[PDB]
């Protein structure tokens, strides 16, 4: 409806450019051993400085339409890589500038920017290809503090405190950051547990720093059949709120109008609920809605068996726990205050029922559920001086686990670039069906150096000579950025996940070739 | 007297990189055989096109003051390069730009700009021994059609014309350049001599092209004595007013009050006269002035022998030319009308003084005399469609002219940048006095990469991998930028003149190392 | 000097594009015989009408520096062609505009423009051979006036009459074109001579409008030797001060002190005089002179045999003439006041020395001075109600009569664009030597449809379909733009000079292909 301005071909790519290139220009300082950070100002308080990526791309919007249009894009790229893998953000903008940059400067007037895509797309699979080939899984605990110290910045203290505490808890337990009141980082293993059933509604978010609901001492409310009823929650809400303490309402499913009630009494009056989704397809649901409130001390309502209804609720049918985190995708429950001797009986229980099974899919989920009641969680406290400082490693400490974690489902390839270099023969051996195909396999090709040559750039040396070097060398051989010198990389260390590599080329790609096939840019002029 | 504006430190060392990079990347992007052109709009018509670096260091000049000195001191680096070798000014003006942005980089508090001065000077003086070390002779003809080829940018018609104009003039004759009105550029080898005395007075230039006085049909008066007296010319310029001829008078001294008279007819009326010092010095000097008395059929006045008055001239004894080019370091005649017969008794005379002489001095002042009598004058036609081609190429010809005679006067190096290449083991070899010398020599070291870099740069490929290569292979090898490949420079002719690069280097190295010590700058307030 | 913007690359391409579009956009319209008319605003009176070309491309200047240099470009390339052949500037426009087009989409980082330069002027050099072999002589009336009606724009009558021009006079004689006073033109067949000897001195001209000095009933001075001295001149110019009838002084050379005097004189008080060098080179410019002032009824002076001085003139010992008209490059004279029985002598005494003459070199010497004695001038009155028409009458007439002389020196071809339509199987037969040249020949033979494509657009009608269906008809079919249909060229009398169309392709290229090896452009910036 508003008034739009038009632009064509080369003026438009270049301003989108132009956009694209200060964003990534911005992001490309903190990559390697020897990147640097970047502060930005907060409207409310302290300016917050930062090494990750994603960070200063969600950071930076431009005046300039057009330009902002590159800058949204490229910010997208750095998105879409933190969602899915948690690390890789800076190579993922500098990959995607990378292939914005050379796609760009290959449209002509007989060129096909589409088939290029189509090129850039096929390439980048043969690359994904190589790297799963490349790809070896993590073994020992030692790699998994190497991975931990890489992805931390090189800070072998949280990637020590980070092996310690998938030792202690498991490789694919749970770990949490939170803030410390000391100097020095600690870990703590204490009650809890999580699953992966996200909030239903986003008006519970309290805490707009995480996008999460927390809570401390807080009532559970646990059901078999999906809590929807007014003289179902109303009582319950009176009894649970009336008690001078929160509620969380772990249901099946909950979608319509009383969750609308709840939102109405959270924004107007200031109620501190929550309501999520119940995990489980079937009987497994059932047994760790009982493992809930054998934990939390509460009592599932409107079961089968004891036909339990919410009209008639008391205070000590409501589960109390020290803490609840919400957040989109999961939800976690700390220190329950249920009985010892109950959670002993159910236990033994499922230690029995283990016992009991040979189906190798059930026995599955009653570990998970055994791992989830008995072994407990493991909660980093960062330590630092300020606010700025402790937020900076928490930064670095999350980027840490994160890579972890990806290193633990999907393996480690070689770090510092040389995975993404090593992938170039591969490209070598791809036939082209057409002479676009062709220039999006080189646009391809000439990107996957990118990486190496920015962490050799921020190192103070020239990163072209480093590649060729590192190219003319073994595959095993390539250079450490923070010594300055070139050396084994598996053991000295240097590794990354193959998730995170494999994923920051994916997002960068998708979007930058996207990008490329544009002829035509709409913006609204500006008032 | 007017109001100053006065800058301290880095703020001012910044904006002075800003504009040294600014006219330095205007010139750059025309070195090499892959180099391009520059378009520079004349006020009085039509644009001039040119690859040549010192005419667009003379073009450029900026609003900015701060950044107008740097750019001034480039300019005179390449203007000073120009006057010294008359070719290399574009690898004068990279190198200069390249001490200066390492020399700004180095400051610190406790830096000595002054002695990292003169560690810059002892790098270049040890860089230039090792060029001299480096240097081969000239002694095929094939040789010099190669270094005429290589300095008018790779075509082999102008190094063939200059090879063949020096085969029939000779390797120390005089070759000029001038407009043709064919398509093709063309040789004739005309009768005249060149004498190496300029003009005396500066108000007889009337070609502002080339600030040269250009006379066509001319008088020439010719006197052993110095013509001083009022009544020693008002004969000579009754004659030449009443003889429609200009006039060029030939002297000893010349100065103060007629050749005021000169000017002062000159810019009232127009009268077509000038002015010349005669050349030598004792006997020689009134020898060569009967040389040209007799050849251009003149007299020499007030001579020891006949005493012939400059009060009573006759035209009879005036010589005709039928050219005259007069520019600020030296003086040519072309065409002139003396008898045949005359001149070839004058060479019989020179022969026999020379067959009963031997003393190995004033027997190269004879050979001189007879190579001026007998040799020839090459002259160069250069072809083109229109104005701003002939132009353009005239440009590039008298290049290859200038680096021709300096590869004769001083020998070969490698081309391509390699022969700098070459020297830096040179300066791995020294030993620096103090911190600040060891900098100096690392900016050399670190500059004489530059100019094989931007040979590259302008070929479209990595110039640092180029540069790598070219010194990890061995000392006969370089890059052929317009190839594209590794090969051998002697036998590709790829070879550039000692002097040429030696003078570049030296004249962006004084200057740039200067510029490099500056701490405060004062400009003035524009109104 | 001043200060000086300085642009790089794309964006200083795109603005001289687009000055190169808009002066080319605007000659454009008048091409062919659907060509429309271009007004001039003139600052004196009234605006000019006009169809020339480089009539409209010299009265276009931008107030954009950028875009002028480019206008100034195509300018110089409209300019060349119309002082080289006088015919053909449009052509010439239009072939430039689109090789720099052409030539500026095919500039990558990987290109060399220098060696795209170089296979253009291969390419043109491949047209120009082939454009040879297509021609062919003159040899009919008839061709003579159908080149001289297409050249007038489809005008029979003036291809009539200067066809009946060359018939009287003669192939090779003088014809010349001024106003008239009638609505309709006429042919005058008058007795008078022409030279190809220009004015002296620049400060000659009266009349701005064609850059001549043109004088009615003047006096005519000759003399055998150079007018000397001033006591020369003194005699002679009271002569021509007191007997009042203006000067016209044939001289060998004139370079010094009088000719001062008398740009004094023409400047200050007003002495319309004129300078003219004597023609030939030996005795045929003392027979030359001999001649004339028999014919005009003057005397020689200074001459060999009777030696008559310049210092005693007589009012009989002058010529005169009706008219005189002094160019840049030629002189003429016309109704000298002669004696008819001195001339019928002389012309006898003509015929008798060619009664003895075998030498086959004065022969022709002798026959042009008969043919200057006894062929005679024709003048071409151009008719019409108004100024404005006359004088685009006159463009025409100028155009046909530079047309017909180029045809009759250099032969036809099939005229529409047809020949240039017929080289470019020419351009198929060529093996380039590397991309560069391969991208400059595609660039030439894009550019060869240029022409015809321009005519047929000018028509009203599809030019690619009118120009692929003459490329796949028979070599001697074209288009008939004014008539609208496909017929032979020949048979209909479409035909153009062969001269005009390779000096035309010729210019264009040069300064085209010059032009788009820029990479840097400095302007001055606007006060
Ligand atoms: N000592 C080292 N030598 C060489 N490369 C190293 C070294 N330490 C880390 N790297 C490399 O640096 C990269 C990680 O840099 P960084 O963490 O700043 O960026 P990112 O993972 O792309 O983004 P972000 O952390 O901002 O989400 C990896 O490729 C890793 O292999
Ligand atoms: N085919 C080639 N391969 C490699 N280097 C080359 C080749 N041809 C010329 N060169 C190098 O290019 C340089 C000359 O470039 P250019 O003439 O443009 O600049 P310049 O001599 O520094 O300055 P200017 O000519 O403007 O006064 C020399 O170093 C020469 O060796
Ligand atoms: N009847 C026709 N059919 C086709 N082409 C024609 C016809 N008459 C003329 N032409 C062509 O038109 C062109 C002449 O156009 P025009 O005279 O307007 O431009 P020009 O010669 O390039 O420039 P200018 O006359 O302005 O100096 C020639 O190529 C000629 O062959
Ligand atoms: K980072
Ligand atoms: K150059
Ligand atoms: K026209
Ligand atoms: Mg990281
Ligand atoms: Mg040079
Ligand atoms: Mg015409």
Redesign the interface.
């Known amino acids: 409806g508003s008034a739009k301005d038009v632009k064509f071909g ?1 003026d438009a790519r270049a301003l989108m450019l132009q956009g694209v290139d200060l964003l990534a220009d911005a992001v490309a300082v903190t990559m390697g051993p020897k990147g640097r950070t970047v502060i930005i100002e907060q409207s409310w308080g302290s300016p917050k400085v930062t090494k990750d990526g994603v960070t200063v791309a969600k950071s930076i919007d431009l005046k300039d339409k057009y330009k902002n249009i590159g800058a949204k894009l490229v910010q997208d790229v750095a998105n879409n890589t933190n969602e899915e893998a948690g690390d890789g953000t800076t190579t993922a903008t500098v990959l995607a500038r990378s292939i914005a940059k050379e796609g760009f ?1 290959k449209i002509s ?1 007989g060129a096909n920017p589409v088939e290029i895509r189509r090129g850039v797309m096929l390439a980048v699979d043969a690359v994904i290809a190589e790297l799963k080939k490349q790809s070896k899984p993590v073994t020992t605990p030692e790699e998994i503090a190497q991975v931990a110290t890489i992805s931390a910045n090189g800070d072998k203290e949280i990637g020590n405190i980070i092996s310690d505490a998938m030792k202690k808890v498991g490789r694919k337990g749970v770990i949490t950051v939170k803030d410390g009141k000391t100097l020095n980082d600690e870990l703590e293993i204490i009650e809890g547990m999580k699953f992966d059933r996200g909030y239903i509604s986003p008006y519970f978010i309290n805490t707009s720093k995480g996008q999460k609901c927390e809570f401390q001492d807080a009532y559970v409310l646990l059901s078999e059949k999906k809590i929807s009823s007014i003289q179902s929650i109303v009582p319950a809400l009176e009894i649970a709120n009336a008690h001078r303490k929160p509620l969380v309402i772990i249901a099946e499913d909950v979608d319509g109008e009383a969750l609308s009630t709840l939102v109405l009494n959270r924004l107007k009056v200031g109620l501190q609920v929550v309501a999520v989704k119940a995990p489980g397809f079937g009987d497994n649901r059932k047994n760790q809605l009982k493992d809930m409130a054998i934990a939390t001390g509460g009592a599932v309502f409107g079961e089968e068996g004891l036909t339990l209804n919410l009209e008639d609720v008391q205070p000590h049918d409501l589960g109390k726990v020290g803490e609840v985190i919400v957040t989109k995708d999961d939800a976690m429950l700390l220190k329950g205050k249920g009985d010892k001797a109950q959670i002993e009986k159910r236990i033994q229980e499922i230690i029995e029922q283990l016992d009991v099974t040979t189906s190798e899919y059930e026995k599955e989920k009653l570990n998970e559920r055994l791992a989830k009641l008995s072994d407990g969680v493991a909660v980093l406290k960062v330590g630092g001086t300020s606010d700025v400082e402790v937020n900076e490693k928490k930064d670095r400490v999350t980027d840490a686990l994160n890579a972890t974690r990806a290193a633990v489902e999907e393996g480690i390839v070689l770090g510092g670039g040389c995975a993404l270099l090593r992938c170039i023969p591969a490209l070598d051996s791809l036939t082209p069906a057409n002479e676009d195909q062709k220039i999006g396999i080189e646009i391809i090709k000439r990107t996957l150096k990118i990486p190496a040559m920015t962490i050799a750039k921020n190192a103070g040396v ?1 990163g ?2 480093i590649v ?1 070097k590192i190219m003319q060398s073994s595959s095993e051989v390539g250079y450490d950025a923070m010594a300055g010198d070139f050396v084994n990389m598996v053991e000295k260390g240097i590794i990354d996940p193959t998730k995170v590599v494999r994923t920051a080329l994916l997002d960068a790609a998708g979007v930058a070739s996207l990008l490329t096939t544009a002829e035509v840019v709409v913006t609204e002029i500006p008032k």
Do not use: N, P, Q, V
């Open positions: 080369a400067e007037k020239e072209s000579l060729e």
